[PDB]
Amino acid sequence: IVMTASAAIKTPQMTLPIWNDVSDEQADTFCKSISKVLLSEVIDKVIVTETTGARSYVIHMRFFDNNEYSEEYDVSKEELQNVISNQFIHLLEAAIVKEIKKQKRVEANNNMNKVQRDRQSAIISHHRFITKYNFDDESGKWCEFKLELAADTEKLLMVNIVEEICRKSIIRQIPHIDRCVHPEPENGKRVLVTEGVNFQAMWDQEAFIDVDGITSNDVAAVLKTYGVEAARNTIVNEINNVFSRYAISVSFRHLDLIADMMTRQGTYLAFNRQGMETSTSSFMKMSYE
Amino acid sequence: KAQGRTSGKVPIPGVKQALEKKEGLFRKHMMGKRVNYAARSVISPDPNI
Amino acid sequence: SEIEIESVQDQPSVAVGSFFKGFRAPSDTTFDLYKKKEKDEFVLHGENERLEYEGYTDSSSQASNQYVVGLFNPEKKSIQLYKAPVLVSKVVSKSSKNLRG
Amino acid sequence: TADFRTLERESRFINPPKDKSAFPLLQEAVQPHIGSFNALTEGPDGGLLNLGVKDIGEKVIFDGKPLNISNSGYLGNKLSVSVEQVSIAKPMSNDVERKVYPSESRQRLTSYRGKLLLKLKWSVNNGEENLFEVRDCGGLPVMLQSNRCHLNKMSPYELVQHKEESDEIGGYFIVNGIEKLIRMLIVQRRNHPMAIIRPSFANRGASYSHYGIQIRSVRPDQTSQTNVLHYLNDGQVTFRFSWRKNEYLVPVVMILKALCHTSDREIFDGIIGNDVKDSFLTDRLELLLRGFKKRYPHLQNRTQVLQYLGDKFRVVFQASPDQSDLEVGQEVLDRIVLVHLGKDGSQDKFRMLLFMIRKLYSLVAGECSPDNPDATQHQEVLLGGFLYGMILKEKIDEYLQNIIAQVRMDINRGMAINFKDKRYMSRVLMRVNENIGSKMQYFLSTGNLVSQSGLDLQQVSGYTVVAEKINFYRFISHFRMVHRGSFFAQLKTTTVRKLLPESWGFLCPVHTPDGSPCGLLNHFAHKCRISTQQSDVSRIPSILYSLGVAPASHTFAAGPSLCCVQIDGKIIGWVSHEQGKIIADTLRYWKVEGKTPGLPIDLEIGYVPPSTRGQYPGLYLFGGHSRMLRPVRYLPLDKEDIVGPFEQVYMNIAVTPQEIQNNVHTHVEFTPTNILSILANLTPFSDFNQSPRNMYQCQMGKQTMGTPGVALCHRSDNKLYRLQTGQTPIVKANLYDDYGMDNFPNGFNAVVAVISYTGYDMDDAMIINKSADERGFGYGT
Amino acid sequence: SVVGSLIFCLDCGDLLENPNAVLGSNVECSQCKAIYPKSQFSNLKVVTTTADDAFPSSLRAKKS
Amino acid sequence: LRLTAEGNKWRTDILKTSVDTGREAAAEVTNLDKDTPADDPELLKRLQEILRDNNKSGILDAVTSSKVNAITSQVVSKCVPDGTMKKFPCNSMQAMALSGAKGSNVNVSQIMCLLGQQALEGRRVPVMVSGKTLPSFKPYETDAMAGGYVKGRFYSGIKPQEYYFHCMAGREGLIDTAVKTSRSGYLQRCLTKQLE
Amino acid sequence: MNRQPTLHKASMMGHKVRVLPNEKTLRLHYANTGAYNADFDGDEMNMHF
Amino acid sequence: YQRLRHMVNDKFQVRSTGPVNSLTMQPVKGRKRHGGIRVGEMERDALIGHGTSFLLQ
Amino acid sequence: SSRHGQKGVCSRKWPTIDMPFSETGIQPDIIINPHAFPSRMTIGMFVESLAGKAGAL
Amino acid sequence: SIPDGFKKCKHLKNFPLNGDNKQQQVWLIKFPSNVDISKLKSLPVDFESSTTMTIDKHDYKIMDDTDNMTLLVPSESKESLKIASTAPLQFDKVFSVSETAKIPAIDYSKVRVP
Amino acid sequence: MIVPVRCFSCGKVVGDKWESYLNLLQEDELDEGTALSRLGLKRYCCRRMILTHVDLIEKFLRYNPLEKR
RNA sequence: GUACUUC
């Protein structure tokens, strides 16, 4: 906070006060709706038989139980079907072609229905590699899709090129937040700490969160969104908590001196030579560094 | 700027790198001077003071 | 299941080779067996239309353990002891003899 | 009832024993040092110097004189110069040559140095004639009580006649009258592939992953060059060298196929081939061989790979001009890549190196835990004297390159008559500087080594320490130092400073300085011995291969399914894993029993289970040099066993004969006090004081004003301390008597008064009765 | 022989080139010319499986 | 320092019912809550993976150390100042400590009743790649005594394994003591020049 | 009076002087060393004037 | 009791008018040359912490 | 200091005239504050003093 | 004619090998150098490895293996080697005899003292 | 080194009772305890002076620069 | 310059 010219932080946290009408039995729906879940968390088993006869790649994507991975994350076949179409296959193109450029430097199912035939040709409209795409609509325990390539890309790895996309794909990405947690209330003050910093998308949930009490840890977002002194009176609580932890006592007057001096010129100061660059006396910059 | 010389046991500081002993020579003299009229020894506890 | 022994020899005539797995083995060319005389150190040699057989037999660790071989039929159920060297092969070709001046 | 004696130890003062010296464990403390420098001369092949100079090679040079297109193609006759025998006899100095003494040499203020001599196997036109010539190269300093100094077979009584201690420890150098001891160092395990995860492999390489496996081979002359193999994200591996200031990322096939007649699937057969179910090895190996058939399809056989190696490495090793690529290629291979197996070792060297590649697949697949660069599982201590021999191996070739550059300096200016004359040989020889004693004295007196070739370790400073003679405790510890390395002082994270419970029994956990050097330099234990000479094996493969182990050429398997047995450097092979569990203690019974002539007792055998992400399975043997040992009481046929570092990790032991239980305990230590060092096992009731108070004491234990030794009238140390009223402690461990500490009194008794009566004492101070000081309380000079 | 995705030559003991990188129906060994292949090789088949360790999730921790 | 013969019987009494708690702690985190020793391969396939990383060890040392700390907290709450031979005020060492003069009550707990559990920084004694904590006992360790927590005091001696754990935890304080002062000085010099 | 490593306003302060012609070691009070955060196990201290 | 190596008359630092350097005209480092105590970065500021100005000068 | 880890310097050489005397008649040569033990935890210097006392008897 | 050593083979022995379509199979085992190559009369065999032997030293353990290695068959003398084949010809059960010395055991009564 | 006269704690002469103590061990076979008692040392402050002496000066004199060997 | 030590 003092030296590093506070930027993207090791752990962005935000405390959210909750109303008196909402209950802990209701907060779990919001922790499962805001928490970000990568595409890897819905995969159970991956086997691929790389046949050749004209490269061919059939991908079998075993899933978990329908009630298991749907109720656990509140994600259903609708969100999972559109995400794979709009994100997984497109990132499958930008990743395989990326490696191509540097390269030269239980019966499953049958009898697909017409609704998935037009849905199959929809992918072929905006994709050129995949030739077949099947999915389990009634139970959702697997996801098989067939690919066809030419001999110009004969040899290449299969698991390591897909696992990246399994971690890069997104099912729903609330900005700058990956997961929300519900800590036990202290001093009767029920709160909700999320692992991120985002105020714009958070202001649209006043039905269950008070916007007058939401506090944050990042000092740049509270500056860009709330103001200068709004960043002052929240970093004061930051270095107050980091000192109240070890039960040591210190007066708030010095903590206000460091607070105001750190934000004395418009936005922020870093107390380093990059922050001392804006000064009047030259010997300050000469003697320091 | 100077020669990628063979292992020299150190290059020779002309002015600037000589004006920074531990990168900050201003600390050697300008910020702290060798104090005259000073003493240094071990201490001992004493009551009746 | 106890069983007896009938044949025990001292001179070698059979051998087993360790080159690789699943060889075509046209089996139409003559190959040589070279002996010595320590003890039990033998080598081999062979040629073909595009193949040359260069082999040895455990130039470092052979004098401590040995191989024996036998056979059994649906009536005998016994094994006749027969000494057998363990050949290790290195199939080579001829694309050598080039150098820079 | 630890009865202390007065008549017996007074009799040892009255007259030293005419027979062998008493308290032999005190002499066994510098056994690492004494045996180190003794090894390079004692034993077969005239020691280590005579075998290393043998493995130096023949260097030739040519003149511009014509022969008499092809006649002009031959540039002329060649001078072949090479050394084959170098020896040091004894330090002599006269006006017949008389004998000099080291204690007399310390008052003489000169360095106690022997006399070096070398013979030159100089030849012409590939040995048409040989001209023998023997000359000296200066005086090399020798330590005390060694194969060269006159204090080797000297009787402990007549040690007093030569003006030194009656129990002289020795093993330290004498340079410019002051004593300096070559500091111990700790390095990587020799002849063992190590899997390690370090992100530094991604900084200097593009698209290179964080995995890595390195092996540290070692020549018979105990030198070493590291063999590192990384893991690339593209699908390949990378081998690199370590030259003067050069590193070359040589691929796997250029360093593997160039060994012997291995151009076949057998490169894949050495890798896991017991089953072909998993394809993570198929895509991996296919990318290696496809990449081999991609950049140069005209390269297929063991000859052209060595012509290409010689072509690329023609100017880096100065192998020129008559040495063709057929000789330079084998030169860079026999001298760099896994040099331990030596010449003619290419029959198993490709099996071990390719198996080292196999474990790289085992590491990146995620079933083998990476080793630690600080744990004592794969860390060996260099004896210091071995570093002296290694320096002599690289510094014996500096004047050889000098005379080579000299005989081709005269060919530039011409006027170089035919070298067939003894006069011309002496003329070109007297111009160069061949004095090496002034350079060995430079390394010792300064501390840092100026290595033209470049050793294997990283730091190029901090190799020797001064002997200030402040007490006997810090001397018996200085001879047992284990310094981690000044390169780690620059490193920030404290993962190495924190202990690791494998230090049990080897290095003391509490004997460690405070402050910045805390956790880095921690001395040895009480009765831990260092093997400084390799046991002549000559039959261990002849008995292991008889116990049921398959041949190294008949196995053609890999993977954790088999138990890979690794003797030092060469691998006998691998067999079914359950045979490793019977042999695990069978070869322990043949080890502890004395009827086996082909198995020494000091043969460490560490067995490893194959389950739960353990280190690569099999069975590891040892017993070379630079190792660490400690005795352990063996219960079956109860006798004294001996084990090493890789033993304590997997198999269990017990510390007291009450913790012994049935069927999962096999070894116990008959003395639970040997865990501590000499200083830590010296303090009474070490199990009652707090650990920060015993580490905070270890410095004071070896920073006393004790009696350094009875040599005052004949020493020449700059600063010296001494006390006179030193008394023996009544409450003392038996080790205080076992090491003859009665000869060196360190402290004295005083009546205690636990009281706040004085007031002046404030929770950290002390009081001394004035009358005691008037009577000589702790008097010193 | 033919194992996995590779077809090794054994009359000279090496690995021949890609049956698709060069003109099909005829492949040649580098060190010596041989009449390859038999034009009846296979329809290539191979299967790879994820190590099941690069998927850090909560429900997999529940499966313990 | 000596306590009554009526006192030490409480020490061995409570320390008898603590030999099973060590196993019950690992039994609580292994999802196999009841009735088995270290014999079942089912529970053998649980903590051999709990030692593969840091977080899985961070979820067992929390319940283990806290429960064992509650075991040693009952001793220090019952024995002193009840089972001691000489007590307040005539007890010199005890009265001096609790009177704020020097030390504290946690300092006399180690010398009077129980030293404690040798805990690293949010951690405990590490485990080898071999899966064993320390070669003094059999592999596949499940116990609080051999798992870092000590049983002996600084009055009647200790066990060498617990002294080794106390030795390793003894240095980790000195290591932090060497880096603690090193990191502090930069905060003063960097902030002063700006705030002069 | 000053003592390294000085870290606060109370680490450096001015004291009165009272000589004693009997010893060689410097002196200090009990309640005084609490501000300096020092001990008497060999801790030396700088005496300015 | 083990008497130690530490200071008996080993520190003994005192200087009123000692020889100064030439490149900087300051007291020479090391007391053997009759040196003087040096104030560092942690003491220069701590001197002005009391607000006593003319002492920093 | 001893070999148990209790450092310290002498504060004043108290004469025998003011040294506390035992029932025997001897005056102890040293004085150790009992207030460092609750923090140094050097019980070894106590139990060893029992052994040293019995050894001296 | 490599190497320059002793000589080439001159004698050969007949091998009864029918190659039947109930089976007549070949038999390969392992054994060390210090053995009873000629003085041995009987060697009991069994199923998967749980057995022993009884000779002078009396420390033996027959070990079987299930999971290349082609044996030549010199049915006559002129070329001195042929190929073993019926339709090469693999081998099913490779054995290996180990010298597993008996483990001294069960004695924890003298080292156990109060 | 040399026998410390004027015992530190008590102040009784000690330098006289060393050869007599050695004679009590040579020609009398008496053990430590009753030897220090018969020798005339009652207080443990004086017992710890004779019983603890090292007698190291005899090892110091084994190097005579004023005499051949 | 390199090494060593003091809270």
Ligand SMILES: [Zn+2]
């Ligand atoms: Zn071919």
Ligand SMILES: [Zn+2]
């Ligand atoms: Zn006395």
